[PDB]
Amino acid sequence: DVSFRLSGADPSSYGMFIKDLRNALPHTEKVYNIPLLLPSVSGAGRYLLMHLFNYDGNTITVAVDVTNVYIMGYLALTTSYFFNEPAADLASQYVFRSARRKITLPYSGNYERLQIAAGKPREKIPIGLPALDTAISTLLHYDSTAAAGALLVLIQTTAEAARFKYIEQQIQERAYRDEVPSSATISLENSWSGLSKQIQLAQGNNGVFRTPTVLVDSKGNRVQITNVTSNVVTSNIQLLLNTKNI
Ligand SMILES: *[C@@H]1O[C@H](CO)[C@@H](O)[C@H](O)[C@H]1NC(C)=O
Numbered sequence: 001d002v003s004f005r006l007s008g009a010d011p012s013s014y015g016m017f018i019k020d021l022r023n024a025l026p027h028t029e030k031v032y033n034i035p036l037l038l039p040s041v042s043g044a045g046r047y048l049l050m051h052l053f054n055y056d057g058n059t060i061t062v063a064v065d066v067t068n069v070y071i072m073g074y075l076a077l078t079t080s081y082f083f084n085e086p087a088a089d090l091a092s093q094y095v096f097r098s099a100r101r102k103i104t105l106p107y108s109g110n111y112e113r114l115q116i117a118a119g120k121p122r123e124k125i126p127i128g129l130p131a132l133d134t135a136i137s138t139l140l141h142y143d144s145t146a147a148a149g150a151l152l153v154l155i156q157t158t159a160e161a162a163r164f165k166y167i168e169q170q171i172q173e174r175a176y177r178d179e180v181p182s183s184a185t186i187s188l189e190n191s192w193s194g195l196s197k198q199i200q201l202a203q204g205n206n207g208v209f210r211t212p213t214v215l216v217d218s219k220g221n222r223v224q225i226t227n228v229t230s231n232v233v234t235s236n237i238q239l240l241l242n243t244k245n246i
């Protein structure tokens with residue numbers, strides 16, 4: 001399992017958490033020195049448990065599929081909560097079975113559905129350590145609309161930060177003050193599967209992407225990524241989604 005405590009949290013302790021999260025994900029191979037997530041894992045070993053504590057020490061446990069860093073559901077006291085999608089239903093066969101009751105959330109876990117449920121896009125939701133403290137607190141008691149925004153915060157501050165050093169750094173900058181994600185952050189999130197695929201295809205293609213990936217940079221400028229010498233590949237992405245899952 002991995003854990004993170006908001007009480008006394010700072011950029012260092014958050015960085016330790018994101019490091020633990022990355023290190024908890026199994027891989028047998030690296031592609032261009034980036035860990036390649038597994039095609040599949042059987043049984044309960046597919047799921048990592050993340051124990052998150054709000055500033056008051058209240059806790060939820062979040063189940064993450066280790067092949068794709070997708071959050072499947074979470075346990076808050078004696079109630080489990082899962083996304084309304086087949087991968088999450090499957091997960092509910094393995095994790096939090098000791099919950100007194102199971103609630104299936106009235107949406108799947110994808111960004112489009114969550115934004116619809118929350119009534120706002122990711123672009124308008126501040127993120128940061130305080131936002132994560134809020135998110136944990138919201139998830140403690142069921143409120144589906146509130147939970148959708150909380151989950152948008154949770155996904156970006158855990159999974160997305162694990163995937164991209166830039167996103168981890170963005171959250172560290174927001175340790176004590178939330179701010180909406182940069183356009184670059186949103187771009188990276190949206191591009192993880194594409195980048196993972198192209199980095200894998202570049203092996204066999206002399207480091208060259210079969211298809212360029214378009215990203216927004218730190219300056220808000222749209223840029224084309226065409227090969228593995230790009231800073232996004234050498235110095236940003238930390239985990240690759242396996243092409244078998246794309
Ligand atoms: C590789 O990527 C860099 C951008 O980082 C670019 O300047 C260079 O022209 C690219 N080379 C090829 C062969 O695509």
Ligand SMILES: O[C@@H]1[C@H](O)[C@H](O)CO[C@H]1O
Nearest residue numbers: 070109110111112155159
């Ligand atoms: O399908 C994706 C993944 O779940 C991502 O990690 C979170 O948002 C969704 O759009």
